[PDB]
Design a protein around this ligand. Structure first.
Ligand SMILES: CCCCCCCCCCCCCCCCCC(=O)OC[C@H](COP(=O)([O-])OCC(O)COP(=O)([O-])OC[C@@H](COC(=O)CCCCCCCCCCCCCCCCC)OC(=O)CCCCCCCCCCCCCCCCC)OC(=O)CCCCCCCCCCCCCCCCC
Ligand SMILES: CCCCCCCCCCCCCCCCC[C@@H](O)O[C@H](CO[C@H](O)CCCCCCCCCCCCCCC)COP(=O)(O)OCC[N+](C)(C)C
Lengths: 70, 57
């Protein structure tokens, strides 16, 4: 009676643990990958992250400058 | 038979018929470095949320 009215079968907890473990393992591997990706992007700078500004080239004036040699 | 130019004529910007070729690289520039990949795609929610410590969202 107690088992019927207060508790559930082993399958529920078993498969819930399976799902929880799967989620947590994915989160762990995601964290490790994210750290490695950050290291690579900060080292090389070829990614979208850690992009530091440079001078905009639309500011350059391309016109004769009173002197042939610029 | 020389007529003296009037005011505002010698300051005109005129065109020149020349047969000298136009310099293709007058600045002697190098080849510009390749730009960043410029990735594109369609946004999806972050996998398993923020994944910050114990937060599940
Ligand atoms: C203090 C609390 C005062 C009342 C606040 C009520 C909600 C409290 C939520 C707090 C956590 C917020 C959060 O980040 O949740 C994400 C997440 C839970 O989200 P979830 O697991 O998807 O939700 C499960 C629900 O069963 C799934 O719930 P659901 O999606 O069905 O939501 C329905 C909604 C129902 O709405 C109502 O009932 C409105 C009326 C109330 O939820 C509730 O209001 C009841 C709770 O919380 C965590 O990841 C862990 C948080 C641990 C605590 C925070 C870290 C510090 C701990 C100590 C802090 C000390 C503070 C200073 C003292
Ligand atoms: C001899 C026969 C009796 C044996 C003794 C049994 C006495 C049991 C008392 C102790 C109970 C321990 C806790 C049990 C309940 C745990 C919480 C919850 O799980 O129970 C819910 C039920 O709890 C009850 O609704 C409430 C219990 C409250 C007991 C209070 C007793 C004392 C009250 C005294 C009041 C006196 C009157 C006021 C006088 C001033 C149903 O659970 P549920 O989420 O479905 O479980 C999921 C799995 N299912 C679906 C298969 C069930």
């Amino acid at each position: 009676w107690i088992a019927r009215t207060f508790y559930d079968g082993p399958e529920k907890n078993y498969e819930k643990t399976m799902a929880i473990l799967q989620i947590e393992a994915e989160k762990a591997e995601l964290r490790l990958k994210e750290l490695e990706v950050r290291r690579l992007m900060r080292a090389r700078g070829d990614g979208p992250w850690y992009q530091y500004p440079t001078i905009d080239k639309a500011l350059i004036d391309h016109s004769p400058k009173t002197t042939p040699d610029n | 038979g020389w007529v003296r130019p009037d005011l505002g004529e010698l300051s005109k910007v005129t065109k020149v018929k020349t047969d000298r070729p136009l310099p293709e690289n007058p600045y002697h520039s190098r080849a510009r470095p390749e730009p960043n990949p410029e990735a594109e795609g369609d946004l999806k929610p972050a996998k398993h949320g923020s994944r910050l410590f114990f937060w599940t969202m």
